Every structure is written in structure tokens, then in C-alpha cells.
């Protein structure tokens, strides 16, 4: 999962910059990655569409956060012993829905598939670290005993 | 109910008009805390020292939840003044002249019709809501005549007719 | 009866003093307001040409 | 298609996980379709619930937390909660509170969570250090997250993240982790000398 993050250092940034205001269907997963990065978002049914009933991302927030040059550091700087409690709290409805499928992601463009793969890899990393923490605690207790 | 809501709207308009008179800035919807004892008396009521202290404490408690800028919000001041005025009208009926006449008669056991100004000043200085010497001098200036006799009937009539428009 | 009267007269006088002081406060504030804002009218410059 | 009741959320969670809500330690009624708008007393049946997740909904007020004797984790993020209140029912067993991103500007009442250990309420409406000063009453608080608040952003845009962390550690000398980064001994010393 970690090696899948640094390989997307600049191609996704360039493609998203040239994407020219993408629609909300992939703005949803873009804001998913944004919440994983833990940046402020407004919380309401903004531009809500009937049929999904999911917290679809806003229109101008994606444009505001697209031109930021810090995305390379966002996709690079991370460490262990993380809980990602806020992200696992706010990312449930996107897992409940079925609009993040790989087949749906590849329909848009190459950057969509890479961003979805990055989000999935980071979620798997968070889950595996959450499993690891009590395990390593038990290992150190057993070593002391 | 609709009638209750309309009456509340009228009371809101009246209390907003009263609040605007003590605004620190025009349209700021804020009143200085030091003028709150002066502003509460402006609404046709006569709060006691205990009542004003309770109003100040309630306003401070309400403003503790918001930014402590030293100014009282229009909504909070309006709610507090509305509650106090409604309670005063409900309990103390508007027989203000008779209430003040009884209060003044409490100081005249013999029913002579007049009360000594120096004794009045001493009693108000030592008893009840102890007031300042400037305030006492204002009392003698307003009430006492050239002979030093305070006709409590006329003084109570003047006190009750203090421009309070119902 | 004398003890009761001695207590009652003092309590009544204290209550009357409190009431009259509060009502005088209100009357004083209302006299101050009735002394309306006769602010000094600043004589603005009378521009003649335009 | 306006709001989801607690009973509807319970039935959906039971359909998803094939487990009874009353017997499940981790109850997941969060992210319902449509989002839940009101929190009611049906949740009192979750006696064995240690992880209640009602987050990402349209809940505006916190209420009806009674009946959950074993409640250790409460998740209420991405909601319309503005005030910390009605936490006395589960204050004895609650250790982590997940109320991040909310519209909370005042931290009155958080002192009721005497047993709170993890408090993630980042991206809220905190604009003054007085709210952070209210967190000093939490003796067991070891982790705090406040990234995205106006107070945090004021230092972040001015490149004063270190000063923000020093102030946070000064007001909470026993804090172990801040914004996902453990508090180091140098930061502790700077907070001590500033205090």
C-alpha cells in the first residue's frame, strides 16, 4: 500500500489540474481523499441528488482545493501508530454506497483510477495498522513476561 | 397561538425600541453593561436592587456562552426585559400611585401629610438599598420644597406619572 | 404583641425603603430620558457656489 | 426520503451485519440513507454496545444516551451538533468522543467526561483559547486533535504550528499526542517555561 502512494506523486496532480472542473461523481472520492487528509469541509446536503442520498461533495470546494501545491506532500508524508479515527468516522457512507467501484472509476479518466487506488490503499493501511497496534502491545507484554 | 405570537411581536418591537436608546453604536445591537441598570428602568418598570442584581447575573450567565466583548446582545437583553416586564405587570398591577402612597405612608405613622427631608435622607442612607450622597441630594432637590416638607401624596403622584407610556 | 410589633415596624420600614429607592431610581432614569437630546447643533459650513 | 429513524437504522445495520443490535458490541447506525435527523430513546436497548456509531447524519442535538451502560465509544461526526451536552448518562464509561468537524464553538460541558481519554473534535468552530482552557479538567485526556479549526488555521497560515502546539501543551501539560503527532520532551519543556 505504501509503495502505491509515492508512484502517483505528480501524474495525478497534473491530470487533475488539467481535468477542468470534474463532475461530482468523482468529486465524491476526491473529497474522500481530502477527508483522509483531514482538511475542512462544509457538512450539509449540498447539491444533493435524489437516488444516492449520500453526502456528495460540493462544487466550489473541489476547485478551491484542486490548485493547492501541497498534494504531493499530502500523498507522501505519513507515519505509523496512527488511528485515523476521524477519517474512519466520516468515510462510512462512501463505503456503504457503490459509486467507488473500479469499473466506475476507470470510466472517467486515468487520474480517477489512480486516486481511487490511493484511497483504497490508504484505507487498507489504516485498517492493518489498527489491527497491528494491540498485536504489538501483546508481543511486548509477552516479551517482558 | 397566533394571537400570542402577535402580542409577542408587539412586545418585541417595543423592547427593541427601548434597547436602541442605549446602544453603544447606532445599529450595533449592543448595549454597554454599565448602562444595563439604567436601561432596564427605561421600560416603564422600577426594579429593586435585588431585581437589578438578578437581571445582571442572568445577563452575565447568558453572555458567558458567547464572546465576552463587554456588551449585551439585543436578543438576550430583549428576552430578559420582556420576562421582567411581563412578571412585573402580572404581579405588581399598575396601581403604582397607590403602591407608592402606601410605601410613603409607612414612614408617616401620625398621618401629618408630610415627611421630614433630613429623616428621609438618613433612613434611605441607613436602611434598604443604601444609596450615594449625590443620589440623596437629588432626592431632596426633586422632592423637598422651600420649607423642607415632602408632601408624599404629590411626590407619589409625580413618581407614578414619570412619563411611562403604556 | 410588643415584640411582634417591634419586628414588624422595622421590616415594613425596610421594605418600604427598598421599594421607594427602586422606584425613585426608575423615576430618575425616566427624568434623564425626558431631558431629551438637545445636542449642540453644529453649524455646518454654508457652501455658496456648489 | 427525508430522515431515517433509529429503528430503521437498527434494521438496516442488522441486515448488513447479520447480528442483533442489542447483542452487538459495535453498533453501526451511521451513514444511513437518508441521513438520520433525530436521536431518540430507542438506542437505550443497546446495553452491550461498546462502540455506537451514529456519525455522518443530520443530528442537531445530543440526547437519549441513557440505557447504554457499556458505552465506551460514541461516534457523532459529520453532524449538525453545536453544543456539548447531555453526556452525563454515559460519562462513567465513555473514553473516546468522536465529534469532529462539527459546528461546536463552545466547550461547556465537556468537563462532565471525567473518564475521557481520546477527544477528536478537529475542524470545529473553535476560535479562542478559552475553550481549550476548559479541557484542563480532563485528567485522563491523552490525545487531542484540532486541525482545521479557525484557531489552528490562524497559526497554520502564518506558519506558527509549533507555537500552536506549544500553547496546546501549555494548557494541557499531560497531553501525549496532538494532531496525530506525539508531544516531545522539547515541546513539553517549551510549554513548561511558557507556563
Residue located via cell numbers 492493518: A128
Q: What is the Cα–Cα distance from B117 to A50, expressed in whole angstroms?
A: 80
Contacts of A54 in chain D (CB under 8 A): 33
Check C22 against B99: CB less than 8 A apart.
no
Kindly tell me the sign of the dihedral angle through the C-alpha atoms of A92, A94, A98, A102.
negative
* Grid cell listed for B105: 405612608
Q: For Cα atoms D185, D167, D55, give the angle at the middle one, nearest 5 degrees.
A: 100
Contacts of D125 in chain A (CB under 8 A): none
D106 in B contact zone (CB under 8 Å): yes
Task: Identify whether the C-beta of residue C23 lies closer than 8 Å to the C-beta of residue B157.
Answer: no
> How many other C-beta atoms can be found within 10 angstroms of the C-beta atom of residue A39?
17
Query: Cis omega before residue B74 (within 30°)?
Result: no
Q: What is the Cα–Cα distance from D104 to A32, expressed in whole angstroms?
A: 22
Contacts of A56 in chain D (CB under 8 A): none
Who among D1, D28, D147 is closest to A38 (CB)? D147
Check C20 against B46: CB less than 8 A apart.
no
- In the Cβ-directed half-sphere of C6, how many Cα atoms lie within 13 Å? 3
Check A55 against D35: CB less than 8 A apart.
yes
Q: Which residues pair with D118 in a beta bridge?
A: D96, D143
Please, which chains are in contact with C (at least 3 CB pairs closer than 8 A)?
B
> Which among A32, A25, A22, A26 is positioned nearest to A52, based on CA atoms?
A25
Q: What is the Cα–Cα distance from D123 to D78, expressed in whole angstroms?
A: 10
C8 in B contact zone (CB under 8 Å): no
> Which among A56, A67, A66 is positioned nearest to A28, based on CA atoms?
A56
B133 in D contact zone (CB under 8 Å): no
Who among D78, D147, D180 is closest to A82 (CB)? D180
Check B138 against C27: CB less than 8 A apart.
no
Minimal-distance CA residue of chain C relative to B165? C30
Please, which chains are in contact with D (at least 3 CB pairs closer than 8 A)?
A, B
Question: Which of A92, A95, A99 should be substituted to probe chain D, the one whose Cβ sees the most D Cβ atoms within 10 Å?
Answer: A92
Tell me the backbone φ, ψ of residue A28, rounded to 5 degrees.
-60, -50
B65 in D contact zone (CB under 8 Å): yes
Q: What is the Cα–Cα distance from B12 to B31, expressed in whole angstroms?
A: 16
B38 in C contact zone (CB under 8 Å): yes
The answer to whether chain B touches chain C by having 3 or more C-beta pairs less than 8 angstroms apart is yes
Check A53 against D33: CB less than 8 A apart.
yes
For residue B65, the distance in angstroms to the closest alpha carbon of chain D comes to 7
Contacts of D145 in chain A (CB under 8 A): 86
Q: What is the Cα–Cα distance from D187 to D167, expressed in whole angstroms?
A: 10
Strand duo D96-98 + D118-120: pairing = parallel
Interfacial B residues in 16-35 facing C (CB < 8 Å) = 21
Alpha-helix residue ranges (DSSP H) falling in D143-183: 150-157, 161-171
Task: Identify whether the C-beta of residue D146 lies closer than 8 Å to the C-beta of residue D125.
Answer: no
CATH 3.80.10.10 fits D1-195, yes or no: yes
What resolution in angstroms, rounded to 1 decimal? 3.1
Based on its alpha-carbon atoms, the radius of gyration of chain C, rounded to whole angstroms, reads: 26
**Distances, alpha carbon B98 to alpha carbons B92, B129, B140, B152, in Å:** 11, 21, 22, 11
- In the Cβ-directed half-sphere of D125, how many Cα atoms lie within 13 Å? 14
> How many other C-beta atoms can be found within 10 angstroms of the C-beta atom of residue A80?
9
DSSP one-letter code for B71 = E
* Grid cell listed for D175: 497531553
D79 in A contact zone (CB under 8 Å): yes
Contacts of D95 in chain A (CB under 8 A): none
Q: What is the Cα–Cα distance from B77 to B83, expressed in whole angstroms?
A: 10
Residue environment code for B144-166, b if the CB has 16+ CB neighbours within 10 A, otherwise e: beeeeebbbeebbebbbebebee
B76 in C contact zone (CB under 8 Å): no
> Which among D179, D182, D174 is positioned nearest to D121, based on CA atoms?
D179
Amino acid at each position: 500500500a505504501l509503495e502505491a502512494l509515492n508512484s502517483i506523486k505528480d501524474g495525478d496532480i497534473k491530470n487533475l489540474k488539467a481535468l477542468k472542473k470534474p463532475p461530482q461523481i468523482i468529486t465524491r472520492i476526491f473529497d474522500c481523499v481530502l477527508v483522509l487528509r483531514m482538511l475542512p469541509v462544509t457538512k450539509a446536503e449540498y447539491t444533493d441528488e435524489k437516488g444516492r442520498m449520500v453526502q456528495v461533495g460540493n462544487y466550489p470546494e473541489a476547485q478551491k482545493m484542486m490548485n493547492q501545491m501541497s498534494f504531493l506532500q499530502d500523498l507522501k508524508d505519513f507515519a505509523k501508530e496512527q488511528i485515523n479515527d476521524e477519517t474512519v468516522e466520516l468515510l462510512e457512507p462512501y463505503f456503504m454506497s457503490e459509486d467507488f467501484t473500479f469499473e466506475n472509476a476507470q470510466k472517467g479518466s486515468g487520474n480517477v483510477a489512480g486516486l481511487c487506488n490511493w484511497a483504497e490503499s490508504m484505507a487498507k493501511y489504516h485498517n492493518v495498522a489498527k489491527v497491528v497496534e494491540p498485536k504489538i502491545a501483546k508481543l511486548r507484554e509477552a516479551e517482558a513476561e | 397561538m397566533s394571537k400570542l405570537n402577535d402580542k409577542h411581536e408587539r412586545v418585541r418591537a417595543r423592547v427593541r425600541e427601548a434597547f436602541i436608546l442605549f446602544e453603544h453604536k447606532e445599529g450595533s445591537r449592543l448595549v454597554d453593561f454599565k448602562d444595563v441598570p439604567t436601561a432596564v428602568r427605561a421600560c416603564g418598570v422600577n426594579p429593586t436592587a435585588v431585581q437589578m442584581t438578578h437581571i445582571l447575573d442572568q445577563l452575565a450567565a447568558l453572555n458567558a456562552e458567547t464572546d465576552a466583548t463587554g456588551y449585551v446582545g439585543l436578543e438576550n437583553f430583549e428576552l430578559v426585559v420582556c420576562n421582567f416586564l411581563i412578571q412585573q405587570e402580572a404581579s405588581l398591577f399598575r396601581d403604582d400611585y397607590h403602591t407608592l402612597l402606601r410605601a410613603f405612608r409607612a414612614f408617616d405613622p401620625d398621618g401629618r401629610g408630610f415627611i421630614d427631608a433630613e429623616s428621609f435622607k438618613s433612613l434611605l442612607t441607613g436602611k434598604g438599598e443604601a444609596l450615594s450622597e449625590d443620589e440623596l441630594a437629588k432626592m431632596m432637590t426633586v422632592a423637598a420644597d422651600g420649607e423642607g416638607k415632602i408632601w408624599y401624596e404629590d411626590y407619589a403622584q409625580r413618581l407614578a406619572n414619570d412619563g411611562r407610556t403604556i | 404583641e410588643r415584640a411582634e410589633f417591634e419586628e414588624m415596624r422595622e421590616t415594613r420600614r425596610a421594605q418600604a425603603a427598598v421599594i421607594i429607592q427602586a422606584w425613585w431610581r426608575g423615576h430618575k432614569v425616566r427624568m434623564v430620558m425626558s431631558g431629551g437630546g438637545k445636542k449642540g447643533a453644529k453649524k455646518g459650513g454654508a457652501k455658496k457656489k456648489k | 426520503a427525508k430522515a431515517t429513524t433509529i429503528k430503521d437504522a437498527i434494521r438496516i445495520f442488522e441486515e448488513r451485519k447479520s447480528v442483533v443490535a442489542t447483542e452487538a458490541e459495535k453498533v453501526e447506525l451511521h451513514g444511513m440513507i437518508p441521513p438520520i435527523e433525530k436521536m431518540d430513546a430507542t438506542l437505550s436497548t443497546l446495553k452491550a454496545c461498546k462502540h455506537l456509531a451514529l456519525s455522518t447524519n443530520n443530528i442537531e442535538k445530543i440526547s437519549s444516551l441513557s440505557g447504554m451502560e457499556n458505552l465506551r465509544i460514541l461516534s457523532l461526526g459529520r453532524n449538525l451538533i453545536k453544543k456539548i451536552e447531555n453526556l452525563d448518562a454515559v460519562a462513567d464509561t465513555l473514553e473516546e468522543l468522536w465529534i469532529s468537524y462539527n459546528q461546536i464553538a463552545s466547550l461547556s460541558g465537556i468537563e462532565k467526561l471525567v473518564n475521557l481519554r481520546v477527544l477528536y473534535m478537529s475542524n470545529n468552530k473553535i476560535t479562542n483559547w478559552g475553550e481549550i482552557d476548559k479541557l484542563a479538567a480532563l485528567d485522563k485526556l491523552e490525545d487531542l486533535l484540532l486541525a482545521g479549526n479557525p484557531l489552528y488555521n490562524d497559526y497554520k497560515e502564518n506558519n506558527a504550528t509549533s507555537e500552536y502546539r506549544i500553547e496546546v501543551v501549555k494548557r494541557l501539560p499531560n497531553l501525549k499526542k496532538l494532531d496525530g503527532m506525539p508531544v516531545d520532551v522539547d515541546e513539553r519543556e517549551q510549554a513548561n517555561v511558557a507556563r
